[PDB]
Design a protein around this ligand. Structure first.
Ligand SMILES: NC[C@@H]1O[C@H](O[C@H]2[C@@H](O)[C@H](O[C@@H]3[C@@H](O)[C@H](N)C[C@H](N)[C@H]3O[C@H]3O[C@H](CO)[C@@H](O)[C@H](O)[C@H]3N)O[C@@H]2CO)[C@H](N)[C@@H](O)[C@@H]1O
Ligand SMILES: [Mg+2]
Ligand SMILES: [Mg+2]
Ligand SMILES: [Mg+2]
Ligand SMILES: [Mg+2]
Ligand SMILES: [Mg+2]
Ligand SMILES: [Mg+2]
Ligand SMILES: [Mg+2]
Ligand SMILES: [Mg+2]
Ligand SMILES: [Mg+2]
Ligand SMILES: [Mg+2]
Ligand SMILES: [Mg+2]
Ligand SMILES: [Mg+2]
Ligand SMILES: [Mg+2]
Ligand SMILES: [Mg+2]
Ligand SMILES: [Mg+2]
Ligand SMILES: [Mg+2]
Ligand SMILES: [Mg+2]
Ligand SMILES: [Mg+2]
Ligand SMILES: [Mg+2]
Ligand SMILES: [Mg+2]
Ligand SMILES: [Mg+2]
Ligand SMILES: [Mg+2]
Ligand SMILES: [Mg+2]
Ligand SMILES: [Mg+2]
Ligand SMILES: [Mg+2]
Ligand SMILES: [Mg+2]
Ligand SMILES: [Mg+2]
Ligand SMILES: [Mg+2]
Ligand SMILES: [Mg+2]
Ligand SMILES: [Mg+2]
Ligand SMILES: [Mg+2]
Ligand SMILES: [Mg+2]
Ligand SMILES: [Mg+2]
Ligand SMILES: [Mg+2]
Ligand SMILES: [Mg+2]
Ligand SMILES: [Mg+2]
Ligand SMILES: [Mg+2]
Ligand SMILES: [Mg+2]
Ligand SMILES: [Mg+2]
Ligand SMILES: [Mg+2]
Ligand SMILES: [Mg+2]
Ligand SMILES: [Mg+2]
Ligand SMILES: [Mg+2]
Ligand SMILES: [Mg+2]
Ligand SMILES: [Mg+2]
Ligand SMILES: [Mg+2]
Ligand SMILES: [Mg+2]
Ligand SMILES: [Mg+2]
Ligand SMILES: [Mg+2]
Ligand SMILES: [Mg+2]
Ligand SMILES: [Mg+2]
Ligand SMILES: [Mg+2]
Ligand SMILES: [Mg+2]
Ligand SMILES: [Mg+2]
Ligand SMILES: [Mg+2]
Ligand SMILES: [Mg+2]
Ligand SMILES: [Mg+2]
Ligand SMILES: [Mg+2]
Ligand SMILES: [Mg+2]
Ligand SMILES: [Mg+2]
Ligand SMILES: [Mg+2]
Ligand SMILES: [Mg+2]
Ligand SMILES: [Mg+2]
Ligand SMILES: [Mg+2]
Ligand SMILES: [Mg+2]
Ligand SMILES: [Mg+2]
Ligand SMILES: [Mg+2]
Ligand SMILES: [Mg+2]
Ligand SMILES: [Mg+2]
Ligand SMILES: [Mg+2]
Ligand SMILES: [Mg+2]
Ligand SMILES: [Mg+2]
Ligand SMILES: [Mg+2]
Ligand SMILES: [Mg+2]
Ligand SMILES: [Mg+2]
Ligand SMILES: [Mg+2]
Ligand SMILES: [Mg+2]
Ligand SMILES: [Mg+2]
Ligand SMILES: [Mg+2]
Ligand SMILES: [Mg+2]
Ligand SMILES: [Mg+2]
Ligand SMILES: [Mg+2]
Ligand SMILES: [Mg+2]
Ligand SMILES: [Mg+2]
Ligand SMILES: [Mg+2]
Ligand SMILES: [Mg+2]
Ligand SMILES: [Mg+2]
Ligand SMILES: [Mg+2]
Ligand SMILES: [Mg+2]
Ligand SMILES: [Mg+2]
Ligand SMILES: [Mg+2]
Ligand SMILES: [Mg+2]
Ligand SMILES: [Mg+2]
Ligand SMILES: [Mg+2]
Ligand SMILES: [Mg+2]
Ligand SMILES: [Mg+2]
Ligand SMILES: [Mg+2]
Ligand SMILES: [Mg+2]
Ligand SMILES: [Mg+2]
Ligand SMILES: [Mg+2]
Ligand SMILES: [Mg+2]
Ligand SMILES: [Mg+2]
Ligand SMILES: [Mg+2]
Ligand SMILES: [Mg+2]
Ligand SMILES: [Mg+2]
Ligand SMILES: [Mg+2]
Ligand SMILES: [Mg+2]
Ligand SMILES: [Mg+2]
Ligand SMILES: [Mg+2]
Ligand SMILES: [Mg+2]
Ligand SMILES: [Mg+2]
Ligand SMILES: [Mg+2]
Ligand SMILES: [Mg+2]
Ligand SMILES: [Mg+2]
Ligand SMILES: [Mg+2]
Ligand SMILES: [Mg+2]
Ligand SMILES: [Mg+2]
Ligand SMILES: [Mg+2]
Lengths: 272, 49
RNA sequence: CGAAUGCCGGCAUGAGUAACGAUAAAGAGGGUGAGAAUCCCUCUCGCCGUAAGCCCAAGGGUUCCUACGCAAUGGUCGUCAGCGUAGGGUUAGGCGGGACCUAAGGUGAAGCCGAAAGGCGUAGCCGAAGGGCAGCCGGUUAAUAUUCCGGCCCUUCCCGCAGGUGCGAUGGGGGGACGCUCUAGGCUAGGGGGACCGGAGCCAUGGACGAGCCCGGCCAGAAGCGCAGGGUGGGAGGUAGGCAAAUCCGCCUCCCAACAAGCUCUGCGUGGUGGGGAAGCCCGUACGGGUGACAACCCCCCGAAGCCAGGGAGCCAAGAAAAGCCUCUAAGCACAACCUGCGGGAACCCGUACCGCAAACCGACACAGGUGGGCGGGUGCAAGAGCACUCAGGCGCGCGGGAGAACCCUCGCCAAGGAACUCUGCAAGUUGGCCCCGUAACUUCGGGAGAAGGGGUGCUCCCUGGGGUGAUGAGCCCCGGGGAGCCGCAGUGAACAGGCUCUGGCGACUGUUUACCAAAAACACAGCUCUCUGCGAACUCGUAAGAGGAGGUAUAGGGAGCGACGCUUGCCCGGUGCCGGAAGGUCAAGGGGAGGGGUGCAAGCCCCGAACCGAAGCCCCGGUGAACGGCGGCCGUAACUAUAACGGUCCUAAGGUAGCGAAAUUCCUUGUCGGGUAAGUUCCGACCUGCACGAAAAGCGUAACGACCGGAGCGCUGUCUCGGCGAGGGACCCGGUGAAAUUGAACUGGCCGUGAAGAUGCGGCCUACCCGUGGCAGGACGAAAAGACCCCGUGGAGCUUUACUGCAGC
RNA sequence: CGAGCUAGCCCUGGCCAGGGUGAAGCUGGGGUGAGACCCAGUGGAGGCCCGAACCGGUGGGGGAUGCAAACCCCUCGGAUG
RNA sequence: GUGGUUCGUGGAGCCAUGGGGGAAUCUGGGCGGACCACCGCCUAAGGCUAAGUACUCCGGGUGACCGAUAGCGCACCAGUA
RNA sequence: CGCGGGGUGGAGCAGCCUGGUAGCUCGUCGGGCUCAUAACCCGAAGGUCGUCGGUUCAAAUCCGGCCCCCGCAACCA
RNA sequence: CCGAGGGUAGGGCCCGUGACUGGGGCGAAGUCGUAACAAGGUAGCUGUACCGGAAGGUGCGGCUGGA
RNA sequence: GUGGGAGAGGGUGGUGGAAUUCCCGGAGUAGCGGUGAAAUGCGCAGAUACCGGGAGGAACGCCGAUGGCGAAGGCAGCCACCUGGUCCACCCGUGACGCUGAGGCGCGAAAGCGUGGGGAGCAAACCGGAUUAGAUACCCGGGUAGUCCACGCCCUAAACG
């Protein structure tokens, strides 16, 4: 989708909005299973650690279910599909037959009315979740766990997905939304299908405000400020850095790798 | 234009208050000295009810 | 003590000088008094009137109210006071806060961290204009009243009776409970009209005894209705979820409703009743009282931004928590308890005066400055919190009286020309509101557009089309259309209310910034690319613990640069950077010990110490420019000259491409050619010899957008020729109050010399009675600041790197 | 020792008269094989325009021992973000 | 790897100690300035212990100390205005 | 005016700093192949080294004086 | 009332001129090269695309007006 | 109409083997690539050649034709669904309903453009290495758009028989 606009105001011409057709007549969220008071704040205890944040629409947290072995075997019916301000993926709310309700990040396909479930059993269909081993090599899938019982963590962004590649001992090779081939443990669930609402990468914010709404204040270039507060700074009419591009704190930012070398997680990785 | 003193009872006891100064090691010393110097008033005289 | 722009105090000097804090304005009669322009009273005049009038909150803390007073405080006076002396004055179960709740955030047992001090920290506690919660209308006082009193209406506890029901938690659920813009229907506040009701009065000055003028025609008030409107399905089976349990909640499945029908829950009327009650007139106030009065308390229309409220519709940025409240069960208890009526009894603590866009708050002041929320009437102008006049209500801004010079501030007007003024139409004018004509290039189809340019605009009578409230009508209230006519110099007649255009530069645009000399071409900005980051992420703060990141996960997050959009971003990896290279060279501790040394009489003990094995790091080998960067010279050559498509040679890592080019870049330069002009170092278009453009420190453009920056026209004009007149506030004269910087002392003249090189002061001559006042500013190398440019001092800081030397960090 | 000025963020409340302009979506018609789409009517979108409060601080004058240690007058920017 | 000592690595002992190795009970251990021999001194890795010594808020004494711009900031209702 | 770089056969460049020895590419001349010209092949010629001085036995080469040439600086006022 | 025309303002077409500019046509014996016609010595021709003093070259696909 | 027939006609989904390139391991050395000849480059840091294992994309050998289908452009592994055309026979139904087709609408190789994905091989441009008097060419080693997918534009052609 992606709503468009006629130019009746510069900016609201290039501006592009999402299409909330996929939003089952829902909107008002569900008390109980979410929301919780969401403590918004751009800095830690005192100081500001991440810069340029703050401001932007008030938000309510939708406490989603990111570990599904909670209900192994208990099937549930997908009730609605709603908007979640805390993420890029739309989320689906679903009523188990157990009578319990919980939200799930909504996969592309999954339609309201559908029945979905989790566990070793589970049929390989959009929405169902199973330990990685029991999933057919090659099938795509989202909401992966990295270590058994620790909760989902990979491919949860709007319309992202990972594809299974092979098996190898108690591990199974994956291919993350980034292109890295990772070795994940067999016992990590991963609900099948891709995340959906993949038009998300196409929304043209539009104006200055639009960014402000999502809570992101203006970002000033180092080049603008002085030597006192950033490498690229001073002296006359602009300047060409004058040294290898660096961050406010001073480490190179055009090429310098960061992953800490001797990490134990190294051996389970294979790509880029 | 607007100036720098905008009186506020709450802020004043809340900041230069007595329990305020007792709470920290530096403030407790603030008291010591003032006590040791004589000062009729150890801390500002906030008021009302 | 004679000096330190010395320290403290005292007193001069300028000086009776400048000022006396808004240009909203005062004049008079009459009291009080030792003394009145300044106090009290009355009459007259002017200002505010989305306040300069009322009501809260913050702050203030006795300033409120009386009596008695002026020494000082008041920019004069002062009998006055916000002043001095004294006494009086603030009354709450319902207003506000607390014996209720929770948010950020504090604090903080459990724990975790840190040399100590201390740091983090789920529970819990605290935490308030946020949730919850029971009072309205009048009366009185010199000062308080939603507080006292009067009328009417409630809230909890506790104790009784009357009974109902398994009662029952700090625990489970339900609810509480939410965005923004736009709105529906019915109401009330508020307002207008009245031929109707009720009223002291009044016929003036030429007309008027008139449906005449003036004044006023309500307020609150339970149940009960009535009119709006909000909430809500009712059963029964099954039940593995809602961290023990639930009959509740959720989830299925069968019935009945789908309707607000029915319960409730508010608002509004109506309401037993309680109360208020104008003008004018008589009084005595520093003000209030009495009468008016058995006052009337009537009908239409306008109408909410408020109320019904958890109303609806649309949208993307997706919109607190806990408690009260209902419900559900548990340990327990069921002679308890809990629920419903009725009674009696009980109901603490703090705030209440007064100021409050200001003389009582923040500005050293009775300071033209600042200060959150609510009310803010009427007429007219299209509307409006706008504008002008005015209600109510409050002010005449705490020095005055004269005079009518220059000059200053502010303001009005102009002959003829009109930008000739000038850095520049800067300033000043012009235009101006509404309605209807009518609108170009260009364009990103929106725009440009209020383009430009025009006409209409007052009253009178006549005809005629709509609505709205009333019944399909009268009235009252809104929009109209036509047609005759009248008066002015002039009809948004007064106040509020664009000058327009062409063209280029710069930036997309709305936005942001140097509080207090810079609002921009700077910053930000959607968007573009590179790069890091697989999640105990990267990265940042902290010693750590921990936190942000983020309850996020590659369509995600950190950094960097460019800066919408269109067309596009060329060659150099030689150097510096980062990225990749399980080979080599070098490499510290350490491992290894050939070998040598010191002592011992010896075993020993104690030192050195070559091979060799030893990481990252550098060296080495490659990648890489939307990484740091860079992207030539000297000749020769075409059948007129001229020029060079061609060639030659040297050095490069490679030898700037497209596109732009006398530029925001051009030194020589007012380059040269064209346009505008009477004339154009500016402007605009060209040329290319680009001193010294050129591609993400982006290149060339672009509709639109601008308190940006040039150039040009038309319009208008005091900008100017070149001034003149007028107004007011000062200036001046008088009474009152009365400063300041500066000051070696002064009896402080011209030329011409001289002098440390710019003489009132020395020399010579000339001139010149003594002292004031208004004015002008040449001088006293005039005041102001130990010159901010400069140099000096082995003075100080801020900033940079391949300066040195450390440290964090890795 | 200070964030009662000032900068930024957090929680929580409050405020912006009255005019313009007319987006999408609707509804009807036209069109087609069905469409795209074109007209009306409705609708009330916008870092939309005019403009008070309010928030500013453009240009000029005055003020400069001031009313004021940032003032006043005229004028001008924005004003549903 | 550092501190303490006059000791700044110096031939650098001793006294303390974060790091790593890691004993012995008298024929056992440390020291006498690398180390070794000899000759000597001491008996670590647990603790307490008056006295002489420091100081002057308070009381007293005494001044080739001040005498109200001095002497404490304060002779005086001052750590006040 | 000041700083440093440079004048070499016809053209463009080496040659010095460690003095004795002028080298390269092109071009020019003679000869070949071709019908002929170019290409290609075979041979050959050409340099007071900007000039006036001396330094040494000996100067392109070292050192001073001028003649042009090129590039860099001309700041604070 | 209309009304010849006169003044104001904005549009539409055509005509002429303008520094310089863009390609063109034509011009007996100027320069550079050699694209095409013989297998033109890389078969050509083509549409498009990038590039180059010039002819032109190369890519992608097409055609016989070649093998 | 009824009843059949051939076909790379179309769309969408799904899949299969061959070879290349890279990755990892085995084993194995002193050269491999390439040309007219060579040079760049590739390799003792373990190349080339061989074996096993894994990723990824594109194109479908034999059938295959001088063949078929399509209105054209064009369509070629296999399977499935949706889909258009086209011929045959039977001579049953309609009953002149027929042809062309200005404009319009639609399709429309390739390259090219937009946004998003994908990227093995190839390959404009471009860097080198030869060739030449000179080579911005033909030849060789590199190599970016592009080539491929989705959707949207582009409407050209020796679109030819
Ligand atoms: N009409 C000629 C057009 O332009 C070009 O032709 C132009 C040039 O190519 C041509 O130049 C030729 C040249 O080819 C040849 N190699 C050299 C010759 N001297 C030139 O000749 C030209 O110049 C001379 C005088 O100078 C004239 O007299 C002569 O006619 C003229 N053609 O002169 C023409 C214009 O005069 C195209 N080649 C041709 O296809 C086209 O038709
Ligand atoms: Mg909650
Ligand atoms: Mg912190
Ligand atoms: Mg803290
Ligand atoms: Mg995008
Ligand atoms: Mg920025
Ligand atoms: Mg700066
Ligand atoms: Mg800083
Ligand atoms: Mg820096
Ligand atoms: Mg510069
Ligand atoms: Mg810089
Ligand atoms: Mg002296
Ligand atoms: Mg006087
Ligand atoms: Mg004087
Ligand atoms: Mg005077
Ligand atoms: Mg005076
Ligand atoms: Mg006054
Ligand atoms: Mg007092
Ligand atoms: Mg008195
Ligand atoms: Mg006085
Ligand atoms: Mg008196
Ligand atoms: Mg008083
Ligand atoms: Mg008093
Ligand atoms: Mg409390
Ligand atoms: Mg809390
Ligand atoms: Mg704490
Ligand atoms: Mg806590
Ligand atoms: Mg609490
Ligand atoms: Mg409260
Ligand atoms: Mg209350
Ligand atoms: Mg009162
Ligand atoms: Mg409960
Ligand atoms: Mg609850
Ligand atoms: Mg009103
Ligand atoms: Mg009369
Ligand atoms: Mg009532
Ligand atoms: Mg349970
Ligand atoms: Mg009365
Ligand atoms: Mg609602
Ligand atoms: Mg609680
Ligand atoms: Mg019960
Ligand atoms: Mg109590
Ligand atoms: Mg009061
Ligand atoms: Mg107010
Ligand atoms: Mg005063
Ligand atoms: Mg006053
Ligand atoms: Mg004031
Ligand atoms: Mg205000
Ligand atoms: Mg109006
Ligand atoms: Mg007004
Ligand atoms: Mg005149
Ligand atoms: Mg005139
Ligand atoms: Mg002039
Ligand atoms: Mg002049
Ligand atoms: Mg100008
Ligand atoms: Mg002007
Ligand atoms: Mg412009
Ligand atoms: Mg701008
Ligand atoms: Mg400033
Ligand atoms: Mg500001
Ligand atoms: Mg964390
Ligand atoms: Mg978080
Ligand atoms: Mg990013
Ligand atoms: Mg930039
Ligand atoms: Mg920039
Ligand atoms: Mg580039
Ligand atoms: Mg490099
Ligand atoms: Mg490089
Ligand atoms: Mg390299
Ligand atoms: Mg490296
Ligand atoms: Mg190494
Ligand atoms: Mg030029
Ligand atoms: Mg000229
Ligand atoms: Mg001229
Ligand atoms: Mg330049
Ligand atoms: Mg530039
Ligand atoms: Mg650049
Ligand atoms: Mg730019
Ligand atoms: Mg702006
Ligand atoms: Mg501005
Ligand atoms: Mg302009
Ligand atoms: Mg002019
Ligand atoms: Mg004129
Ligand atoms: Mg004048
Ligand atoms: Mg006057
Ligand atoms: Mg003299
Ligand atoms: Mg003299
Ligand atoms: Mg004398
Ligand atoms: Mg003067
Ligand atoms: Mg002076
Ligand atoms: Mg000085
Ligand atoms: Mg020195
Ligand atoms: Mg400092
Ligand atoms: Mg519409
Ligand atoms: Mg609107
Ligand atoms: Mg706006
Ligand atoms: Mg505005
Ligand atoms: Mg030491
Ligand atoms: Mg020892
Ligand atoms: Mg010893
Ligand atoms: Mg010894
Ligand atoms: Mg002791
Ligand atoms: Mg004495
Ligand atoms: Mg004395
Ligand atoms: Mg004293
Ligand atoms: Mg200077
Ligand atoms: Mg021409
Ligand atoms: Mg020729
Ligand atoms: Mg040829
Ligand atoms: Mg050819
Ligand atoms: Mg081609
Ligand atoms: Mg074909
Ligand atoms: Mg038949
Ligand atoms: Mg046809
Ligand atoms: Mg096509
Ligand atoms: Mg294509
Ligand atoms: Mg290749
Ligand atoms: Mg040749
Ligand atoms: Mg090639």
């Amino acid at each position: 989708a992606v709503k468009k606009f006629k130019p009746y105001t510069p900016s609201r011409r290039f501006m592009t909005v999402a299409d909330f057709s996929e939003i089952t007549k829902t909107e008002p969220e569900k008390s109980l299973v979410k929301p919780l008071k969401k403590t918004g704040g751009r800095n830690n205890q005192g100081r500001i650690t991440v810069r340029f944040r703050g401001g932007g629409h008030k938000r309510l947290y939708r406490i989603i279910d990111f570990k599904r072995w909670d209900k192994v075997g208990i099937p549930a019916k997908v009730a609605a599909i709603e908007y979640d301000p805390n993420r890029s993926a739309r989320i689906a709310l679903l009523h188990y037959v157990d009578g319990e309700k919980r939200y799930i990040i909504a996969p592309d396909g999954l339609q309201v009315g559908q029945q979905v479930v989790a566990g070793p059993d589970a049929p390989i269909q959009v929405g169902n979740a199973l330990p990685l081993r029991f999933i057919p090599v090659g099938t795509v899938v989202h909401a992966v766990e990295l270590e058994p019982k620790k909760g989902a963590k990979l491919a949860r962004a709007a319309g992202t997905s990972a594809q299974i590649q092979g098996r190898e001992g108690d591990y199974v090779i994956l291919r993350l939304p980034s292109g890295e081939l990772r070795k994940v443990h067999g016992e990590c669930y991963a609900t099948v299908g891709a995340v959906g609402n993949a038009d998300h990468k196409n929304i043209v914010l539009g104006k200055a405000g639009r960014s402000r709404w999502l809570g992101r204040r203006p970002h000033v270039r180092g080049a603008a400020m002085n030597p006192v507060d950033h490498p690229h700074g001073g002296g006359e009419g602009r300047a060409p850095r004058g040294r290898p591009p660096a961050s406010p704190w001073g480490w190179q930012t055009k090429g310098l790798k960061t992953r800490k070398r001797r990490k134990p997680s190294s051996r389970f990785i294979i790509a880029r | 234009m607007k100036r720098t003193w905008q009186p506020n009872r709450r802020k004043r006891a809340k900041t230069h208050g007595f329990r305020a100064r007792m709470r920290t090691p530096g403030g407790r010393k603030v008291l010591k000295r003032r006590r040791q110097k004589g000062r009729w008033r150890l801390t500002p005289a906030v008021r009302k009810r």
